[PDB]
Amino acid sequence: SMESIEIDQKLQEIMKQTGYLTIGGQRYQAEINDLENLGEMGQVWKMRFRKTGHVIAVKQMRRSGNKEENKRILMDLDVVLKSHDCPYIVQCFGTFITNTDVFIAMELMGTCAEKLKKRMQGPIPERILGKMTVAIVKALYYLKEKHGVIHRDVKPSNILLDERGQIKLCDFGISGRLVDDKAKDRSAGCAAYMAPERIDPPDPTKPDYDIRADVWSLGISLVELATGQFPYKNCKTDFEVLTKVLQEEPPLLPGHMGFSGDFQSFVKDCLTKDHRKRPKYNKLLEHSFIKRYETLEVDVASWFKDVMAKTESP
Ligand code: NA
């Protein structure tokens, strides 16, 4: 099975570099006992590496665990390692093994955009969202252009922030390799952020979708974070949400709040219903919203720290 060969092939490549953490410009030999457990994050554990004091995120892959779940963890790990040089994607410090487990050390961030939304109990400021848009669109473009990967789960819980003001994309466990710029897997992703063409393919003989589906998910995420509410929150079921995505006009930023013209334009472009007219990432990167925020000095770090200091855990 070519699925079996590449999975063991990738596993071998990773096992060759196991037994050490590269953190702070130094390579350290590493075992489970070198790591103090500090509790789960709803398996992903927050752990202190005793040799340096760094607090990290630790994923646990079981030998006797769910086969589909271990495939996702290996897929996520593979994409993370390949994406080392992209600064908008979380970093892995290394792996180490027991007889029964593979532990994976990841960069601990502060929190996700979904949790920030809950802490804010309202909007995240346009200036933060502008930096976020730049970062996430560059991460997704990087995955597409350099690895032929479609993320398939762009949503606020996968956008991370830290106290240094970095914004990064994470969780590629359901990411797919594109074939001729197309993906086939119709079950991969969260229903609420699905584009119209993924819910109901316009051509039932050619049902496959591409990165433009993720562009829609980005748009929905931006409206959600900019207003403090998921646009279809008052739908009583997932089936109702999807029915509205199909039948109604797309959500927009509401004009009465005074969002800048270029942000309104960007969201409106991302939320073009007809996927043939929806821009790809290379076109989004030319958008004046992005150009404005690429160069703009925004103190995301101070804003982040202030929010985390002033609010309770959701
Ligand atoms: Na990276």
Curated annotation (Swiss-Prot):
Residues 35-290 form the Protein kinase domain. It catalyses: L-seryl-[protein] + ATP = O-phospho-L-seryl-[protein] + ADP + H(+); L-threonyl-[protein] + ATP = O-phospho-L-threonyl-[protein] + ADP + H(+); L-tyrosyl-[protein] + ATP = O-phospho-L-tyrosyl-[protein] + ADP + H(+). The active site is at residue 153. Activated by phosphorylation by specific MAP kinase kinase kinases such as MAP3K1/MEKK1, MAP3K3/MEKK3, MAP3K11/MLK3 and MAP3K12/DLK. Ubiquitous; with highest level of expression in skeletal muscle. Isoform 3 is found at low levels in placenta, fetal liver, and skeletal muscle. The keyword ATP-binding applies. One of its GO terms (molecular function) is molecular function activator activity. Signal peptide: none annotated. Its EC number is 2.7.12.2. It is found in: Nucleus; Cytoplasm. Its cofactor is Mg(2+). ATP binds at residue 59. Its main location: nucleus. The modification Phosphothreonine is found at residue 185. It is an enzyme of class 2 (transferase). The modification Phosphoserine is found at residue 181. Interacts with isoform 1 of VRK2. Interacts (via its D domain) with its substrates MAPK8/JNK1, MAPK9/JNK2 and MAPK10/JNK3. Interacts (via its DVD domain) with MAP3Ks activators like MAP3K5/ASK1 and MAP3K1/MEKK1. Interacts with MAPK8IP1/JIP1, MAPK8IP2/JIP2 and MAPK8IP3/JIP3 scaffold proteins. Interacts with RASSF7, the interaction promotes phosphorylation. Found in a complex with SH3RF1, RAC1, MAP3K11/MLK3, MAPK8IP1/JIP1 and MAPK8/JNK1. Found in a complex with SH3RF1, RAC2, MAP3K7/TAK1, MAPK8IP1/JIP1, MAPK8/JNK1 and MAPK9/JNK2. Dual specificity protein kinase which acts as an essential component of the MAP kinase signal transduction pathway. Essential component of the stress-activated protein kinase/c-Jun N-terminal kinase (SAP/JNK) signaling pathway. With MAP2K4/MKK4, is the one of the only known kinase to directly activate the stress-activated protein kinase/c-Jun N-terminal kinases MAPK8/JNK1, MAPK9/JNK2 and MAPK10/JNK3. MAP2K4/MKK4 and MAP2K7/MKK7 both activate the JNKs by phosphorylation, but they differ in their preference for the phosphorylation site in the Thr-Pro-Tyr motif. Belongs to the protein kinase superfamily. STE Ser/Thr protein kinase family. MAP kinase kinase subfamily. This is Dual specificity mitogen-activated protein kinase kinase 7. It comes from Homo sapiens. The lineage of its organism: Eukaryota, Metazoa, Chordata, Craniata, Vertebrata. The chain holds residues 86 to 404 of 419 of the full protein.
